[PDB]
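Journal club prep, notes for RB
We'll compare a predicted complex against what the paper describes. Inputs for the zinc ion case:
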Amino acid sequence: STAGKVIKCKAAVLWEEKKPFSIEEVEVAPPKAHEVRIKMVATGICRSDDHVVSGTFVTPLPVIAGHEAAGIVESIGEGVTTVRPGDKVIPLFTPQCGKCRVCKHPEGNFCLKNDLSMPRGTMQDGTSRFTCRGKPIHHFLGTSTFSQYTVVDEISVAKIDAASPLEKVCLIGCGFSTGYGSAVKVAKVTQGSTCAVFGLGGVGLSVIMGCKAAGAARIIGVDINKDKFAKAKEVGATECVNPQDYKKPIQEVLTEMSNGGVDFSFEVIGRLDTMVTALSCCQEAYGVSVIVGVPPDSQNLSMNPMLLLSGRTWKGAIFGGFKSKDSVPKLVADFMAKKFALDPLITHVLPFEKINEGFDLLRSGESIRTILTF
Amino acid sequence: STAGKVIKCKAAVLWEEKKPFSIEEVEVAPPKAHEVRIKMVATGICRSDDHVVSGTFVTPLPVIAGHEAAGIVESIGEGVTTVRPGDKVIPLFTPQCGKCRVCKHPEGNFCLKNDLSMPRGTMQDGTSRFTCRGKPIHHFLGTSTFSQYTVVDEISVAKIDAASPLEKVCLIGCGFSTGYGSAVKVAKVTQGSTCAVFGLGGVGLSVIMGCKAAGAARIIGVDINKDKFAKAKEVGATECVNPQDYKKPIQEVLTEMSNGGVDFSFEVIGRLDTMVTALSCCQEAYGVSVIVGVPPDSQNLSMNPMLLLSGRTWKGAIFGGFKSKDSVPKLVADFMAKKFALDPLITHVLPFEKINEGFDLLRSGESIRTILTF
Ligand SMILES: NC(=O)c1ccc[n+]([C@@H]2O[C@H](COP(=O)([O-])OP(=O)([O-])OC[C@H]3O[C@@H](n4cnc5c(N)[nH+]cnc54)[C@H](O)[C@@H]3O)[C@@H](O)[C@H]2O)c1
Ligand SMILES: NC(=O)c1ccc[n+]([C@@H]2O[C@H](COP(=O)([O-])OP(=O)([O-])OC[C@H]3O[C@@H](n4cnc5c(N)[nH+]cnc54)[C@H](O)[C@@H]3O)[C@@H](O)[C@H]2O)c1
Ligand SMILES: OCc1c(F)c(F)c(F)c(F)c1F
Ligand SMILES: OCc1c(F)c(F)c(F)c(F)c1F
Ligand SMILES: [Zn+2]
Ligand SMILES: [Zn+2]
Ligand SMILES: [Zn+2]
Ligand SMILES: [Zn+2]
């Protein structure tokens, strides 16, 4: 038995920015009250994890990163009521405390217990469950999935279907749900509309899936890497365009292609310039533009507010606008009922030991999602 | 009869920026096909007219400004079907052609025939109906209401109730409808919500009216001129704050007052800094901020897109989001049935010949709306 004991296990520790993960032994404390210890089964490589490595997103180091995953509960602390040992679970990088004003709001999902705004890199109680070489190691977004075992707060885990294939449904922990919800819930894409999607990685492909599910008539994918276009068309893009191919700015190209601007645009990259381009290419009176990409730390964009005064709507969201603990189990149930596909997002499946090779595939432009298996 | 003849009349001509209007004789050509010549009865002084004088809003000079008005049709050109001589009318600074993709959209109102986005200062046919001292004079937003007679395109005029008091309902041509619609139609303020309104001039007071009509529980007025607070409270503000009174930035003050951010905020001034402040003070996960104020020509704001990524919605609108020709007659009918009040906005009345004194009252901070009578 491991319950109530320290577990020594393998994890991928990030000791400093812009260095490889160190795959080595850590100690994982048992769960305290209202905490859950999870044996990980699969974890995806999201560009947001790479933002920690690159310093695009600032969080305390050293850290166990990883936030897109699925696993099996090993043990629960006193007072846990929502999961039991043996349950399949997805950790929730956006928690759902159920008590804060955001959790109580019909349209809010960015629970005030999140560790994204002012990252502390701890459990809810302000402490860490991880040690490595005698040093405390930070958590990441209350998840820390690049480890054979993690400990999460109960508000940061959802129970899912016992028959779930965890090597696929781990994508419901971030990339699929983010993109799909950004289209269907945040933008509320309408039947017959024209959409533009900037960035055709895992999250942008999931935005395309959602635009197609919502009945968009035209879905224009935009990427500087034309190798991304074939899969974008497979999942619903009707056209793809590469800004590098044009003498005009791409906002002008997209305005022309859409006979005066798109209904819905999505920034799914993480660049200030494409956030402003994406806003500009939506129709000036009734267009909607959604920011999904994570912008670089502490950098402001510049824009002319006449883009908004004419009638545009500009919004952003975390995790597709989904209330995480209510939504994740339903999204898994929908996947099991064949309501959407996840295989188009998975280009590579590697053992966890090859985490650094998986990050190199993402950085080279060669992968959509690599799933790491423990 | 004057039908088919040039009319000589008085108008307020703006020859140069940052100068008084010149009240002098102009020649007003008769209406061409699908044009309407109007004998003006009353016109309001809106801060946007002052933006023409100050070069905040660039439009070609020399010009006859004025856009908030009511009058009586003197004659109609060939093919006009929607008004007749003797009808009471309100000119529409945002037209409603009924044919463009915006007019056909259920939520658009910024008709593509507008002269706001890229001002030419002409009729739809690219020519002027005004001569002064033998020189052609520009139109303004297809309205030019600072004249005893004007000529407008048929898509820029609405027929209103024959029993309308024109010295009141002129406000439905801009300030009332803009503010009220910004709350009820654009923001869609909800019952029990907390609103913050930046700027307590005629348009911000109309925003407060709309927030109260929508059932907001708290309406916080924000102005650096504390003389504006009494009227704001009379029309529904529950609290007023002066940023000058505080050591901390007012976005932090309003976040504290609202226990974590407001539900709806409105920028009703025209400053880049207050546009960003108003966005910041709405709750980060579910808040909505609406830009109403007109920004200085060609100037960009700077902002951190993490304000949107957490969940905020940022939008703007012209004319409260109202489809102008459909909505203006209905707003007049509702005014006649006492569904809203206009007198709280009217602080001063002057004859048209005292237009410069009316602008002096606006610039000193003393007036809300001055109504000029012809
Ligand atoms: N809001 C959220 O909750 C959330 C969730 C998940 C991911 N993210 C962010 O979303 C973004 C996309 O993540 P991902 O899909 O995993 O990344 P990814 O797989 O790296 O995809 C990014 C795509 O953008 C393309 N690209 C780069 N520059 C440009 C350009 N100038 N114009 C057009 N295309 C360009 C690039 O070729 C690639 O295909 C990242 O910033 C993530 O951090 C946000
Ligand atoms: N979007 C539209 O369709 C539309 C229609 C009508 C007016 N406008 C614009 O709306 C704005 C307001 O017009 P209005 O009500 O006639 O103008 P106004 O009567 O000049 O009122 C503006 C108010 O802002 C106050 N103010 C100035 N600076 C600050 C500050 N830093 N903080 C807080 N308060 C401040 C000022 O004291 C005044 O009471 C102007 O920019 C107009 O051009 C837009
Ligand atoms: O990919 C999900 C995700 C985000 F949406 C962020 F905004 C972020 F800062 C982050 F670290 C993250 F992992
Ligand atoms: O006050 C109405 C009004 C506006 F809403 C503008 F955006 C503008 F540029 C302008 F000149 C104007 F008069
Ligand atoms: Zn919460
Ligand atoms: Zn992610
Ligand atoms: Zn139109
Ligand atoms: Zn106005």
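Talking point for the session: Residues 243 and 250 of chain A are 6 Å apart (CA to CA).
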